[PDB]
């Protein structure tokens, strides 16, 4: 939330054209990244243990 507010301050968008679009998309993409990273991490730890 803080980053999104700061971003719409820096981008200079003054009044109301500031849809939650970037917020929703970045939030959805962060589930994908974290899940993929976690799977890779589990595999690596398993491999080192083996």
């Amino acid at each position: 939330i803080h980053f999104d507010r700061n971003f719409y301050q820096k981008m200079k968008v003054g009044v109301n054209p500031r849809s939650p679009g970037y917020f929703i998309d970045g939030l959805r993409a962060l589930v994908k990244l974290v899940t993929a990273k976690y799977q890779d991490l589990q595999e690596n730890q398993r491999f080192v243990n083996v």
Binding site: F3, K10, G26, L27, L41
Partner: protein
């Protein structure tokens, strides 16, 4: 040596959750920013 790698691995695990935030932000927000503006965003995020 293996133990040292495991300690590093735990640190790496902690670091990765934090880093996924940064990656997702570049994907969603940075594509239309100029390089200097990307730098300022990176700073103001990092803080």
């Amino acid at each position: 040596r293996w133990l040292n790698t495991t300690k590093q691995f735990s640190k790496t695990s902690q670091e990765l959750i934090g880093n996924c935030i940064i990656s997702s932000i570049y994907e969603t927000y940075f594509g239309h920013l100029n390089e200097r503006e990307r730098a300022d965003m990176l700073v103001i995020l990092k803080r």
